[PDB]
Design a protein around this ligand. Structure first.
Ligand SMILES: *[C@@H]1O[C@H](CO)[C@@H](O[C@@H]2O[C@H](CO)[C@@H](O[C@@H]3O[C@H](CO)[C@@H](O)[C@H](O)[C@@H]3O)[C@H](O)[C@H]2NC(C)=O)[C@H](O)[C@H]1NC(C)=O
Ligand SMILES: *[C@@H]1O[C@H](CO)[C@@H](O[C@@H]2O[C@H](CO)[C@@H](O[C@@H]3O[C@H](CO)[C@@H](O)[C@H](O)[C@@H]3O)[C@H](O)[C@H]2NC(C)=O)[C@H](O)[C@H]1NC(C)=O
Ligand SMILES: *[C@@H]1O[C@H](CO)[C@@H](O[C@@H]2O[C@H](CO)[C@@H](O)[C@H](O)[C@H]2NC(C)=O)[C@H](O)[C@H]1NC(C)=O
Ligand SMILES: *[C@@H]1O[C@H](CO)[C@@H](O[C@@H]2O[C@H](CO)[C@@H](O)[C@H](O)[C@H]2NC(C)=O)[C@H](O)[C@H]1NC(C)=O
Ligand SMILES: *[C@@H]1O[C@H](CO)[C@@H](O[C@@H]2O[C@H](CO)[C@@H](O)[C@H](O)[C@H]2NC(C)=O)[C@H](O)[C@H]1NC(C)=O
Ligand SMILES: *[C@@H]1O[C@H](CO)[C@@H](O[C@@H]2O[C@H](CO)[C@@H](O)[C@H](O)[C@H]2NC(C)=O)[C@H](O)[C@H]1NC(C)=O
Ligand SMILES: *[C@@H]1O[C@H](CO)[C@@H](O[C@@H]2O[C@H](CO)[C@@H](O)[C@H](O)[C@H]2NC(C)=O)[C@H](O)[C@H]1NC(C)=O
Ligand SMILES: *[C@@H]1O[C@H](CO)[C@@H](O[C@@H]2O[C@H](CO)[C@@H](O)[C@H](O)[C@H]2NC(C)=O)[C@H](O)[C@H]1NC(C)=O
Ligand SMILES: *[C@@H]1O[C@H](CO)[C@@H](O[C@@H]2O[C@H](CO)[C@@H](O)[C@H](O)[C@H]2NC(C)=O)[C@H](O)[C@H]1NC(C)=O
Ligand SMILES: *[C@@H]1O[C@H](CO)[C@@H](O[C@@H]2O[C@H](CO)[C@@H](O)[C@H](O)[C@H]2NC(C)=O)[C@H](O)[C@H]1NC(C)=O
Ligand SMILES: *[C@@H]1O[C@H](CO)[C@@H](O[C@@H]2O[C@H](CO)[C@@H](O)[C@H](O)[C@H]2NC(C)=O)[C@H](O)[C@H]1NC(C)=O
Ligand code: NAG
Ligand code: NAG
Ligand code: NAG
Lengths: 730, 754
C-alpha cells in the first residue's frame, strides 16, 4: 500500500497544491508587463532581462487597494481600480485614479468619477472613455475636463456604452459596448433599451443588520418576453467640443434585421474609416454582417448592400453562440472568419469586401477552434486536428500566399505533457507565449515567430510536481465509445492504483450543454480529484449529440429538441461505462450544474434505473423561465405556432413521479441572477406535490456560481456527504 | 436441554414459549404516520349554533336541522337538496337573527389566519327563494348580520356598506377605502394576527341602531416583500408586499367611529361621530385592544399605549342633544403593570350587566393571579369577587343571578379546565358544574350557553375521548349526550395507542408541570429516546389534559419515542410571577429551564442520555435553535420549523410587548444578544434541520435565511428544506404530509432508530 497522502477535500476547499501561472501584458512587439512581489516588471521579450516598471512603494502610499492596474498604450499614465464592487458576471463598479508615469504624480484634477461602470484607454495614445450613470464620457487627456457624449442614460432603462444583463451574459459576453477606431479618432457605442423588457424580482437578505429584505429587479427577458432594443452610434473623439454636445452618427441595422427583433452580436473595426457590424434576427438562423464605411463629404457612415454578407443555417443555429469576429487584413478590403463548410466542420474562409464568394483555406474532419493572429506571411489559429482529438488544442500557421503550406507550431513540442496548447501573440506577432493546460502540469513558454524558436520557459509548475509526487493524484483516461457509428469521446478520472479486476463506484459529472465539451485533456485540481483520490470513485463525463468542437451535425442534433437527445446519450454512456466492468452497476450516480443540473434532473426523472442518486445545483426546470436568447437559439419561440409543445414536454416537473426511485439533492442560491430560484422552487413544489422525498439546501444571498468562500466550502462539503452516504462509502 | 430429556425437553420448550408469551404477546397494530397523515382515526365533534334560548342549529347529512334542547326532537331547517341547484359549493351559511334570511358563502378565498374574501348570496327562507337583486358584491372581505332583525353590513374594497333590507340597495358609509393603505371595517395584518385576533373591525350596536367601525392607516407602515412562485404557468414570479411593522418600525394608526344605521338615507352620505382615545393614550402610539357594546347608548373601548404597560378603558355614552358620544374622565379605568406587560395578550373583554351601570372583568389580583372583578361604571374601586392560587381562564356567561366562568382551580391543575358558577348576590356561593361530571374521562372542559343561558353545551377535550353533552341551567340537569366518539373508541381499542402522563417537577422550590406521551407497553426499567416538543411562548401552556392524535402519537406508538413538553418560567395560567419572569429578557430563562427539563428527565431513569432531541414551531423553533446553540450538550439533534431568529424581524406588537423597544436607550442590548445567529459556533456540536415556508407571512423567511447564512459562514453542516408557496402553517395537504415525512426521517436517523 502507498503511504502518500490522498488529495483530501480540505486540499480542494483550502487550495493547498496551487497551479502556478505566468500572465503577462504585451505592451509592445518586444516587451511585456509581468507583475511580481507587487511590482510591475518590464521583461525584454527577446533578451529576457527584467527592468522594474512600478515599485510597490509607488502605490504602497496610495491609501487604497488597487484591484487591477491598466497601462496606457503610450505608457504616460496608468489607471488604478480601487473600491471594486462586482455586479453580474462581467458588470462591476469601482473608482479609478490616473497616475502620471512621466512626472510620477497622481492626477488630482477632473478625476474619473466614483462608482465608474467601465473605463478604457485609447487604442494608441492616452485618451480615456469612462461610463458613469449609464452615460458615456470621453477625456481627451487624463488631466483635462471630461466631455459628455450621451445624455439619455437611465438606470435599468437606457443602457449607454454598457451591455444589459441578457447581452452581458449571452450576446457580447462582456460589460463593454465602447469600441474605439484603430487610431482612436472614432468611438463606437451601443444604446440598449430595456423599457419593455420585463423585470425579474428576487429578494436580497443583505446582512444580519438589515431589518427589511431588499427586493432586487433586473431587466431579464425570459423566453418569449420582449427582448431589449439595440442601437449603434459612432462619435468623433478628436472633434469633441466642450462648447457643444458631440454629435453621434447612428448606423442603421441591416434592412433584413429591421423587419423583426435584431441582435448586434459583434462590432469589429476594419480600418480607420471602415467598421463591420454583424447582426442576427430574433430567430437565430439568419445573420447579416455589414461593412459600413465612413464618408467625408456627408461625414455620415453608410452601409453598402453589395458588401453585406448573409449566413443562414437550416441544420440549426447560425454561429456556435454568435458569428465569429472577422480578422480584417491591414488594407481592410479582405477579411478572414471561421465559417462552417458544406460538410459541417467550421473552418477558416478568406473573403473580400467586393467579392461574394467564400474561399475556405482549411478543410477536414477537424474544426478550427479560433484565429490567433494575422501577419501577412502566415495566419495563426488553434485547431483540434492533432491526433484527430476533438478535446485537444494546438497552434497552427498557414502561409497566406500558399495555403498548402500549413505548419503546426506546438503539436510536437511536448506531446506527453502538453496537448491543450493555447497562445497569446505580441503586438506585431513577433513573440507568442504558448501555454499548455493539460494533460501534464501547466507549462508556460515564450517563442519567436521569426524562426519558431522557444525563447525560454516562463513557468514549469515544477514546485507543484514534486509536491504532487508525494500525493496519490488520480489518473485521467480520455477515450471514445462508438455509438451508432458516431464516435463520442468520454473522460474518466480513474481512482489512484486503479485495477479493472476490482469494482469501483461511478459518478457521471454532466453538463451536455449545446456546443459543450466535457472530454478535454486539460489538467485540473477539482472536487473530482478528491472523490477519486480519497473516496475512490470513478468520476466520468461524456459528450454525446449536442457536443461542440465535433461538427455541426452532432452540435445541431438537439436543435429544437432540448433535454431530449443529450439526456438519452448520457444514460446510454452510463450503461456503456457499467458494462465496461470496473463500474459497480449498483452504485452509479450523476451530478450537474445549470444545464448539467437540468440534464441531471431529466436523467433522474427518466426512470431508466441506471442512476441511484443525483445532485443538481441551480438546475433549469422549465425553458420558458430561462432567458430568451439562450432558449430561442436552441428551442425556438414558445408559441403554439412554433415549438411550444417541446417547451411543455421538456419540463423537470413532468418527470417528478419517477424521482421516487432515486435520491435528489436540490441546491440553489436565493440571489441567482442567471437560473432564477424560480426554477428550483417549481422543482421542489412538484416533488412535494407528488410526494417524492428529496433533500435540499438553499444558500442565502448566493449567485449562480455560489463561489463565496464560505458557501463554496459548504456546498462541496454537503455534496461530499450526500455522495459518500449514497455510495455507502465510509 | 440436549440431555436425557426428550418429550420433556419439548415440554420445557412449551413452558419457555408460554413464559415468553406472558412477557410479550402483543399483536395489535401501532398508530402509524399514515394513520396521522390520512386521519384514519378521526375524532367526531358536535358544534351546534344556539340560534335561540331553547333551540339550536346542527348540521347532519349536509341538512341544516333545528333541535329543541328541552324536548330533544329536531326538524329540517333547510334540506341539503335545497342548495343542490345553487350551482356553487356553499362554504358556510349565516342565519339572520329573525330566521327570515340566510347568507350562502361561495368562491371562498383565504388570505392570512383570519382574513378571507368570498361571494355571498342572500336566501329568502320565507319565500324559499334566493335574493337576486342588490346581491352582495363579489370579493366582499367581511359580512355581518345585525344582532337583531335582518340588517346587513359588509366591507368591500376596504369600504363599509350597510343594507337595511336584503332586497334593498346598499348604503355606502366610508369612501376612504384603499388597498394596503386605509383599512375601514377590516383589520390590517398586525391587528388581525395580534390585537383583535380577527378580520372584523365592525361592531353592531345591541339592537342595531348604531354600527361601530375602525379606520386603520398603514400609509407609513413599512412593507415586507416576499416573492410568490404561483404555479408552473406563471413565467415571472410575483413579489407580495404586506404591511408588516417589525420591532420598532412605524405601527399603524387606529381611529374609532360610530354611525346611526337607523338614519341611513340614499339622499346624502351618513356622518360618523369619532370617539377619540383618552389623552393618556394620545401622548404616543396607542392600540384599540377591544370594543364591547354595553347598552344601546353605551360602548366600552380598551386602549393600550405602544409601551404595553399602561391601558385605559373608556366607557362612552351617547348624548341625544349633541348627537356625539362623550366619555366621562371618572368612568375611565386605568390598568398598569410594573412587573410586566398588561394582560395575558391584551386587556381582557369586559362583561357589562343588562342595566349597563355595572360590569365584571378579569383583572390580576395583588397576589398575581387573574380573577373576576366587579366594576361599577360610577366607581373607581375594583372589588374582587373571586380569589385564590388558581386563575379565572375566562367568563362564558353573565345571567342576572349567576356568573359562569372556567378556571384551573380543580385539583390545582394549571391545565385542567372546569365550569364554575357563582351566585351574584352571594359571592361566597360558588358551585362547580363539571368538576364531578366524569373526572376519569373529562378534566378539560369548554362551554357554550344559549341566548338566555337557559341551556349550555359542555364540550369535553380530555383526557379521555372528546365528549359533547347538553345540560339545562335551571337545575344543572344534563339534558343528554350529543357526541360520545364511541365509534372512534371502538377502533382505538384495536391499536396500541400510547398513554399520557401529566405531573410536575420542583425547581428552586417552585412547581413546574410537564407532560410525557409514554409509549405503549412502557417499562420504567427500559430507557427510551426522548424528543422534547417545546414552544415555551410567554403565557403559553404546553402541558395540559387534552386528548390529541398528532405526529407525537406515531412517534410514541410506532417509533417508541417518549415525547415530553415542559412549562418553565414564562408559562401561562400559572400566575403573573411565572408569566412575567421573562419580561424584557426573551430567549433567556425559558431556554435554560427547557435544558434543565431534559436534564431532570434524563435522571428520571427511563430516558436514554445519549439520545435526547427537541423540536418546535415559531417561538418553539427559536427555543429549539437556542437550546441547540446553548452548547449544553444535553440534546443530540433538533428540528426547527419556521423559527424566529433576531427578535427585531418579528412584528412590533408581539416583540415590544415582552422584549421592549429595539432602541439604544431601551432593551437594544438584549435585541442584539438574543439572536440565534450569535450561537452559530455551538451549532457545530449538534445536528440541525431548518424548515421554513417561502411565503410565510408571520415568521418571515428572512429570519430563517439569516440563520442559514450564519451556519454556512461558521461551517455548520445542517439539512434544510424550503416548502415553496407555503404559509407559517405549511398545512397544504401535500406539504403537511411531506414535512412530517421528512421530519420523521431525520428523527429516526438522529435517534439511530431501526
Ligand atoms: C425605449 O423604448 C420605449 C418603448 O418603445 C420608448 O418609449 C416611447 O417613447 C416615445 C417618446 O416620444 C413615445 O412616443 C409618444 O408617447 C406618447 C405617450 O407616452 C404618445 O401620446 C405619443 O403619441 C407618442 O407615441 C412612445 O409611445 C413610447 N413607447 C412606449 C411607452 O411604449 C422609449 O422612448 C425608448 N427610449 C429610447 C431612448 O429610445
Ligand atoms: C394616513 O396617514 C398619512 C400620513 O400621515 C396621511 O397622509 C397625510 O395627509 C395629510 C392631509 O392633510 C397631509 O397634510 C398635508 O400635506 C400637504 C402636502 O402633501 C400639505 O400641502 C398640507 O398643508 C398638509 O400638511 C400629510 O402631508 C400627509 N402625510 C404624508 C403624505 O406622509 C393620510 O391622510 C392618512 N389617511 C387617513 C385617511 O387618515
Ligand atoms: C536587455 O539588455 C539589452 C542589452 O543587451 C537592452 O538593450 C539596450 O537597452 C538600452 C536601454 O537604455 C538602450 O539604450 C540600448 O540601445 C539597447 N540596445 C539594443 C541593442 O536594443 C535592453 O533594453 C534590456 N532590457 C531590459 C528590459 O532591461
Ligand atoms: C446637451 O444635452 C443636455 C441634455 O439634453 C442639455 O442639458 C439640458 O439643457 C436644457 C437647457 O434648457 C435644460 O432645460 C435641461 O434640464 C438640461 N438637461 C437635460 C437632462 O435635458 C445640454 O444643455 C446640452 N448642451 C448643449 C450645448 O446643447
Ligand atoms: C485616424 O483615422 C481617421 C480615419 O481615417 C482620420 O480621419 C481622417 O483622416 C484623413 C487623413 O488624415 C483626413 O483627410 C480626414 O479629413 C479625416 N477625417 C476626419 C473626420 O477627421 C484621422 O485623421 C486619423 N488620425 C491620425 C492622427 O492619423
Ligand atoms: C428559421 O427558423 C424558423 C423557425 O423554424 C423558420 O420558420 C419556419 O420555416 C418552416 C420552413 O422551413 C415553416 O414550415 C414554418 O412554418 C416557419 N415558421 C415557424 C413558426 O416554424 C425559418 O424559415 C428559418 N429560417 C431559415 C433561413 O432557415
Ligand atoms: C342529503 O340527506 C339525505 C338524508 O340523510 C341523504 O340520504 C341518505 O344517504 C345515506 C347514504 O347513502 C343513506 O344511508 C340514507 O339512508 C339516506 N337517507 C335518506 C332518507 O335518503 C343524502 O345522501 C344527502 N345528500 C347529500 C348531497 O349529502
Ligand atoms: C318537539 O315537540 C314539541 C311537542 O312535544 C314541539 O312543540 C310544539 O310544536 C308544535 C308544532 O306544530 C307547535 O304548534 C306547538 O306550539 C309547540 N309547542 C311548544 C310549547 O312550543 C316542538 O316544536 C318540537 N321541536 C322540534 C324542533 O321539532
Ligand atoms: C358622498 O361622498 C362621496 C365622496 O366625497 C361623494 O362622491 C364624490 O363626489 C364628488 C363631487 O364633486 C366627486 O368629485 C367625486 O368623484 C365623488 N367620488 C369620490 C370617490 O370622491 C358623494 O357624492 C357623496 N354623496 C352625497 C349625496 O353627498
Ligand atoms: C335601539 O336603541 C336606540 C338607543 O337606545 C333607540 O334610540 C332611541 O330610542 C328612544 C325610544 O324610542 C328615543 O326616545 C331616542 O330618541 C332614540 N335615540 C336615537 C338616537 O334615535 C332605538 O329606538 C332602539 N330601537 C328599537 C327598535 O328599540
Ligand atoms: C413601562 O415601561 C417603561 C419602559 O421600561 C417604563 O419607563 C421606565 O421607567 C423607569 C421607572 O419606572 C425608568 O427608570 C426608566 O428609565 C424608564 N424607561 C426605560 C427605557 O426603561 C415605564 O415607567 C413603565 N410604566 C409603568 C406604568 O410601569
Ligand atoms: C516590493 O518590491 C521589492 C522589490 O525589490 C521586494 O523586495 C519587496 O518584497 C516587495 N514588497 C512586497 C510587499 O511585495
Ligand atoms: C470617491 O468617494 C470617496 C469617499 O467620499 C472620496 O474620498 C473620493 O475622493 C471620491 N473620488 C472621487 C474621484 O470623487
Ligand atoms: C359576481 O360574479 C358573478 C360571475 O361573473 C356574477 O354573475 C355576479 O353578478 C357577481 N356578483 C356581484 C354582486 O357582483
Amino acid at each position: 500500500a502507498d503511504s502518500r497522502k490522498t488529495y483530501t477535500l480540505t486540499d480542494y476547499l483550502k487550495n493547498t497544491y496551487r497551479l502556478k501561472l505566468y500572465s503577462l501584458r504585451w505592451i509592445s512587439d518586444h516587451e511585456y508587463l509581468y507583475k511580481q512581489e507587487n511590482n510591475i516588471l518590464v521583461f525584454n521579450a527577446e533578451y529576457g532581462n527584467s527592468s522594474v516598471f512600478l515599485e510597490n512603494s509607488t502605490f504602497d502610499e496610495f491609501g487604497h487597494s488597487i484591484n487591477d492596474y491598466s497601462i496606457s498604450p503610450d505608457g504616460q499614465f496608468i489607471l488604478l481600480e480601487y473600491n471594486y464592487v462586482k455586479q453580474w458576471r462581467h458588470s462591476y463598479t469601482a473608482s479609478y485614479d490616473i497616475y502620471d508615469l512621466n512626472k510620477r504624480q497622481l492626477i488630482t484634477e477632473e478625476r474619473i468619477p466614483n462608482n465608474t461602470q467601465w473605463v478604457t484607454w485609447s487604442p494608441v495614445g492616452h485618451k480615456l472613455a469612462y461610463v458613469w450613470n449609464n452615460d458615456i464620457y470621453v477625456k481627451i487627456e487624463p488631466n483635462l475636463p471630461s466631455y459628455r457624449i450621451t445624455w439619455t442614460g437611465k438606470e435599468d432603462i437606457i443602457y449607454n456604452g454598457i451591455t444589459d444583463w441578457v447581452y452581458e451574459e449571452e450576446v457580447f459576453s462582456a460589460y463593454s459596448a465602447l469600441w474605439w477606431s484603430p487610431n482612436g479618432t472614432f468611438l463606437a457605442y451601443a444604446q440598449f433599451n430595456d423599457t419593455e423588457v420585463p423585470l425579474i424580482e428576487y429578494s436580497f437578505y443583505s446582512d444580519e443588520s438589515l431589518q427589511y429584505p431588499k427586493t432586487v429587479r433586473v431587466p431579464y427577458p425570459k423566453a418569449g418576453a420582449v427582448n431589449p432594443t439595440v442601437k449603434f452610434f459612432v462619435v468623433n473623439t478628436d472633434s469633441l467640443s466642450s462648447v457643444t454636445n458631440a454629435t453621434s452618427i447612428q448606423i442603421t441595422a441591416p434592412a433584413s434585421m429591421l423587419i423583426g427583433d435584431h441582435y448586434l452580436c459583434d462590432v469589429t473595426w476594419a480600418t480607420q474609416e471602415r467598421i463591420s457590424l454583424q447582426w442576427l434576427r430574433r430567430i437565430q438562423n439568419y445573420s447579416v454582417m455589414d461593412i459600413c464605411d465612413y464618408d467625408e463629404s456627408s461625414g455620415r457612415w453608410n452601409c453598402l448592400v453589395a458588401r453585406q454578407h448573409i449566413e443562414m443555417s437550416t441544420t440549426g443555429w447560425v454561429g456556435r453562440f454568435r458569428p465569429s469576429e472577422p480578422h480584417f487584413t491591414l488594407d481592410g478590403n479582405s477579411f478572414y472568419k471561421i465559417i462552417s463548410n458544406e460538410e459541417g466542420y467550421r473552418h477558416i474562409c478568406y473573403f473580400q469586401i467586393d467579392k461574394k464568394d467564400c474561399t475556405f483555406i482549411t478543410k477536414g474532419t477537424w474544426e478550427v477552434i479560433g484565429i490567433e493572429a494575422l501577419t501577412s506571411d502566415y495566419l495563426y489559429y488553434i485547431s483540434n486536428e492533432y491526433k484527430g482529438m476533438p478535446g485537444g488544442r494546438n497552434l497552427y500557421k498557414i502561409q497566406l500566399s500558399d495555403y498548402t503550406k500549413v505548419t503546426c507550431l506546438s503539436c510536437e513540442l511536448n506531446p506527453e505533457r502538453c496537448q491543450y496548447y493555447s497562445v497569446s501573440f505580441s503586438k506585431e506577432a513577433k513573440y507568442y507565449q504558448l501555454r499548455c493546460s493539460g494533460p501534464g502540469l501547466p507549462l508556460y513558454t515564450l517563442h519567436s515567430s521569426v524562426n519558431d524558436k522557444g525563447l525560454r520557459v516562463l513557468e514549469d509548475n515544477s514546485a507543484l510536481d514534486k509536491m504532487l509526487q508525494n500525493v496519490q493524484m488520480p489518473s485521467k483516461k480520455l477515450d471514445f465509445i462508438i455509438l451508432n457509428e458516431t464516435k463520442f469521446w468520454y473522460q474518466m478520472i480513474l481512482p489512484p492504483h486503479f485495477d479493472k479486476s476490482k469494482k469501483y463506484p461511478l459518478l457521471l459529472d454532466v453538463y451536455a450543454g449545446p456546443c459543450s465539451q466535457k472530454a478535454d485533456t486539460v489538467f485540473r485540481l477539482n472536487w473530482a480529484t478528491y472523490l477519486a483520490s480519497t473516496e475512490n470513485i470513478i468520476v466520468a463525463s461524456f459528450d454525446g449529440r449536442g457536443s461542440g468542437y465535433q461538427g455541426d451535425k452532432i452540435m445541431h442534433a438537439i436543435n429544437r429538441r432540448l433535454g431530449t437527445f443529450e439526456v438519452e446519450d448520457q444514460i446510454e454512456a452510463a450503461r456503456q461505462f457499467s458494462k465496461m466492468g470496473f463500474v459497480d452497476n449498483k452504485r452509479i450516480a450523476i451530478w450537474g450544474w445549470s444545464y448539467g443540473g437540468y440534464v441531471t434532473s431529466m436523467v433522474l426523472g427518466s426512470g431508466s434505473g441506471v442512476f441511484k442518486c443525483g445532485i443538481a445545483v441551480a438546475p433549469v426546470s422549465r425553458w420558458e423561465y430561462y432567458d430568451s436568447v439562450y432558449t430561442e437559439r436552441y428551442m425556438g419561440l414558445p408559441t403554439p405556432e412554433d415549438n411550444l409543445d417541446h417547451y411543455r414536454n421538456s419540463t423537470v416537473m413532468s418527470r417528478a413521479e419517477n424521482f421516487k426511485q432515486v435520491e435528489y439533492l436540490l441546491i440553489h442560491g436565493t440571489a441567482d441572477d442567471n437560473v432564477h430560484f424560480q426554477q428550483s422552487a417549481q422543482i421542489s413544489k412538484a416533488l412535494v406535490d407528488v410526494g417524492v422525498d428529496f433533500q435540499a439546501m438553499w444558500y442565502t444571498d448566493e449567485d449562480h456560481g455560489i463561489a463565496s468562500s464560505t458557501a463554496h466550502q459548504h456546498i462541496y462539503t454537503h455534496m461530499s456527504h450526500f455522495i459518500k452516504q449514497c455510495f455507502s462509502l465510509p
